[PDB]
Design a binder for this molecule. Sequence first.
Ligand SMILES: O=C(O)[C@@](O)(COP(=O)(O)O)[C@H](O)[C@H](O)COP(=O)(O)O
Ligand SMILES: O=C(O)[C@@](O)(COP(=O)(O)O)[C@H](O)[C@H](O)COP(=O)(O)O
Ligand SMILES: [Mg+2]
Ligand SMILES: [Mg+2]
Ligand SMILES: [Mg+2]
Ligand SMILES: [Mg+2]
Lengths: 468, 468, 158, 153
Amino acid sequence: TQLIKTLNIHQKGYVNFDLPNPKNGEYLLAVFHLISGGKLNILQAAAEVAAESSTGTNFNVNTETPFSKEMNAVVYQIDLDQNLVWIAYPWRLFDRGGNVQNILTYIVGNVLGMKEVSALKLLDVWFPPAMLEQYDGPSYTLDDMRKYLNVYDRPILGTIIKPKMGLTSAEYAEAAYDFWVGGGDFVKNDEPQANQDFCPYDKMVRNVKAAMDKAVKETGNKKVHSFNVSAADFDTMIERCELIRNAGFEPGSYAFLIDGITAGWMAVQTLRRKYPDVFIHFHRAGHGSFTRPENPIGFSVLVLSKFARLAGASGIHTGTAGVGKMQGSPEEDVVAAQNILRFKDKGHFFEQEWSKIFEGDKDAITIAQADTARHVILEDDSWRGVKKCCPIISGGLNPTLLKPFIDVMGNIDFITTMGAGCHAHPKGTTAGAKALVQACEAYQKGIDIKEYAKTHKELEEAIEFFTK
Amino acid sequence: TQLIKTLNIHQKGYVNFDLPNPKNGEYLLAVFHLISGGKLNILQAAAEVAAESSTGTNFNVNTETPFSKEMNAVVYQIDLDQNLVWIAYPWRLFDRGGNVQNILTYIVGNVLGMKEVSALKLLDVWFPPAMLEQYDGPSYTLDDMRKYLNVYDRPILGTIIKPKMGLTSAEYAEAAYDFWVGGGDFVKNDEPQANQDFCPYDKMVRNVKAAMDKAVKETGNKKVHSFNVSAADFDTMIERCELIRNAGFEPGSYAFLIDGITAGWMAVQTLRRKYPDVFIHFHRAGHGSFTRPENPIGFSVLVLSKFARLAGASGIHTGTAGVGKMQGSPEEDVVAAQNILRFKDKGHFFEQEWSKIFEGDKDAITIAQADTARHVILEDDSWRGVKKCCPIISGGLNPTLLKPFIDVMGNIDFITTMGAGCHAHPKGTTAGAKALVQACEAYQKGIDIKEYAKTHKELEEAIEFFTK
Amino acid sequence: RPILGTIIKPKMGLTSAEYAEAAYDFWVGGGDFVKNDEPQANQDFCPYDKMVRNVKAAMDKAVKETGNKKVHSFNVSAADFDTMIERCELIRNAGFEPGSYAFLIDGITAGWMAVQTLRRKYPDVFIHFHRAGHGSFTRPENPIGFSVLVLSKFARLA
Amino acid sequence: TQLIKTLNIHQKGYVNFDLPNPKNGEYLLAVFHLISGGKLNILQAAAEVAAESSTGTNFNVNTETPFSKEMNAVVYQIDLDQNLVWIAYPWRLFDRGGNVQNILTYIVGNVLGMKEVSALKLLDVWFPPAMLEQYDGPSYTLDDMRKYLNVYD
Ligand SMILES: O=C(O)[C@@](O)(COP(=O)(O)O)[C@H](O)[C@H](O)COP(=O)(O)O
Ligand SMILES: O=C(O)[C@@](O)(COP(=O)(O)O)[C@H](O)[C@H](O)COP(=O)(O)O
Ligand SMILES: [Mg+2]
Ligand SMILES: [Mg+2]
Ligand SMILES: [Mg+2]
Ligand SMILES: [Mg+2]
């Protein structure tokens, strides 16, 4: 009321507390933690943020048409105690053809640089079904990799080949084989692993193909390697992708890892569209400045995961919820993982149903019940909703912390990669992989890891090394 | 000394205070503001940051080869009062072929997410000449656009067509013509301006071509439009680029604008390599979470500008140094602009010469003296050094603030775009452009804007509107 | 007068820009001929294409400044034929003035087949026979081998 | 010691007897039987050979960068009785793409023609695994021909 009266003529055009239905399908919804930078109240700063993020500037321009005002972002709700502002963005503003970076430019672009706000954090977003129809979403999912690996009822066990850099193609392939033949299913390139002169990319791909062939023949179990395809340009990325394709691995045995933050959302969308049959591994390296709680300006991990799911990433790192070495808590990481893995989640502020069909459809209710029961959904009915994005759990994880994270995760529908958790095991990479599989089996059987390690030497050695 | 003794075996491998020559060409140099997250001193947290950013993890992995330890990032200097840590990264770690996002993944990637640090801000970086040889740098520069525009001895005057979104192709072209025929040289797409359904991209390009043709014929002066080519994927971006190319504009009359942060560094490098003859307009929308001083985790504006120059961007927004609406001060913005515009700058912590030749070369000294004298350098001798990256000054700027920013800028070698400074002028876009040109002429003649506006109605109206 | 030439020292370790700068420094100082050192190739710190482009720019600058033509001898010895011809075509499509570039081949290490292939594919290009490794054949301290005269005669025949 | 003190400034950049790990993977190792050709001792001749076979000449050139010194071949060991010199060549010097004749041009190229040495025989070389990854190696082997011929034992 009073804050509305404090608004000038320009700011009033971007504030509508009497918006009749924010969830009518015309508006993406964004909740911002907002603290003004000085001399502006919360509502004035929110109006400036909405103008700078939809259509306007610090002033009313004389070129403003009545049609332009329809595209205005409007503040439709404010919590004064929490400093929360809700903004409805007409998704007509966004670039057509499922352009996610255009959305990020609108909502988490210039507004982060504004001195009018001392804190601007996009906590959550809500995608209407009409807007959700515009975007690709995932095409390859965790269920497809589960089918390829024949891994069900447990998290897909993965590793990151440590050292991060400095190994040759032969050494990297040897480490990948050592993890694979030890029982591990998933091996990923470290995020900066690329065509370095001491580890050439084609040699690395060929050696990884040979190592995976040997591991598959020895264990009788399929294996998956996630190749980092982040390059200087598109041509190098697609050349590396085609090099992986023409190796040639079995279909499903390789995933395309892209550094989403650094390489860009364009690279993620290009990989998703060019290779819909390949698991797109979204690596979120560099996300911290956006998502760290110490940083007042940015967007939450939940928003990043939601936009990664929208962009078509098959999976994205979500965080260990403070169990690992990455910041910082379960309330962000587990919530984001549930939101990207579930057909419907809470989440932080918006009830996000990833269905693209009518709200009260009986088939939608059946799909939600099946998704809650952990059955595969959207296989023959992919039009109904967005496919799930697989959470990927990494960062300072050893087998001893496998059970606690699941205790925070609430489920086992995720890929877990442990670089130092296995390669820093005193008895080698294969011993670390065996210890990880032993910890997973102990969790599956309900046996405590200390009790389980009495008959499993690798698990006991991992507990002894990783407890100090 | 004591902090070195506090280090364990793993951390000692990433700390070398006795590094004999950090500037030997083997190491990129990075200065980090670092505050530990808890239970770790400054040296321990710096060692973890260096390990996580070069080769290692929280532990020593048994796969580590002696060759791997050579690629270790080493902390070679620490200021305890300022909480500053210097890390030398062997640039052998970085992906070959001039991949900049690989560098960003190494140095400002995973380390931002580490809970071991409560503050981690990359304040500055230093590129050795041997490393600088590996990267493209700019190919089209501000000097080429100055030659095309026939604009010398004053900043290139530019505008952003406000409203940011909501105008049709005809209205946008009309606003661009109104600025161009008013004396303004440069018109840019707003950062999210793309193929929206109400402003189709091909229609916008054709209408902008017609408007620029009309403005060029009426004024007898060439004009430049910067088109936003940020798309969902590479194919859409190149389709829009080719659409601009086959419009067909005069060569030099169009620039390719890319949202570098959101669309990604891969898009910037791809635009640089595919179109070296086109001004690559780096728009840094979303940079704030990286660069805002309120955010303890990220990298400085200077580092972003330096990496944009390395990636081949012809120009990048640098900030109004607190004069405009964007945060927040001259010490970051002006320093970054000088570092990307000069052949050699201070800068924050490293003396960065952008020459790729011997440090004491007489020709290098002559080139530096010519660059200080504002002569065009590196035309016939582009091997010698990296071409300058033009600073672009935008954000809450009206003509009344044109003189003060130059007072902080120390030069007029920049493109200045004013969206609300001209389109919010009460007498229209052409009146705003005339007021901006009048303010520029008043600065060039030393006449105060209040004195100059007595014989120039547009400048007086702009002052009256923008002084309150 | 003899054609004045130089070899860019250091032999290795210079970037493409530093190499082109040294070549320009010799060229603008009155020197006519600049050659790749015999192992100078597509090293990671001095990429071959960047070296060729920078040498082309430096030769252009020296030619305009001095008003005299300049010649650079590029080492085209590679691992295989395909790499050698790729480097040769990279030199040709730089594109230098015809006669301003010579092809340097390590005739002993790379082999006589490389020398003959360079001669037959590029008869209009000066074939620079570098004889690195010849000493074991030609050193007087070595009782087994062949004289320098024999090596020169077979080079001229090839 | 005394041979180290006999060296000049130029030769000292190609002699490092305190090389910490010659087998760290950065260096191809070469052992040379070396007898100097007159007025140079074993260490000076070895330094000249290392300079001529990695980056240097008979003098210090003014174009030498600090990066260039990182590519210097260094004599890291000497057997005075056997006239043996160990030189660590950073394999960064070698042409990329598995170029073997480039390696031979470096190590057994110009140095054979030097008059500063009266005997220069490369007895042995050691390839680090990181260097060995760069090169092809045999693809068809004696085992393949044994399988084709059905000839074993
Ligand atoms: O390099 C690394 O740090 C990791 O490989 C983990 O290594 P360790 O498991 O051996 O520690 C992961 O890439 C990061 O955890 C990603 O972070 P996030 O999951 O938060 O996106
Ligand atoms: O939408 C905007 O906010 C602007 O068009 C400025 O508009 P006005 O000039 O009309 O205010 C610019 O894109 C930002 O300033 C970029 O910020 P930076 O220069 O810091 O990268
Ligand atoms: Mg990693
Ligand atoms: Mg139904
Ligand atoms: Mg010079
Ligand atoms: Mg030579």
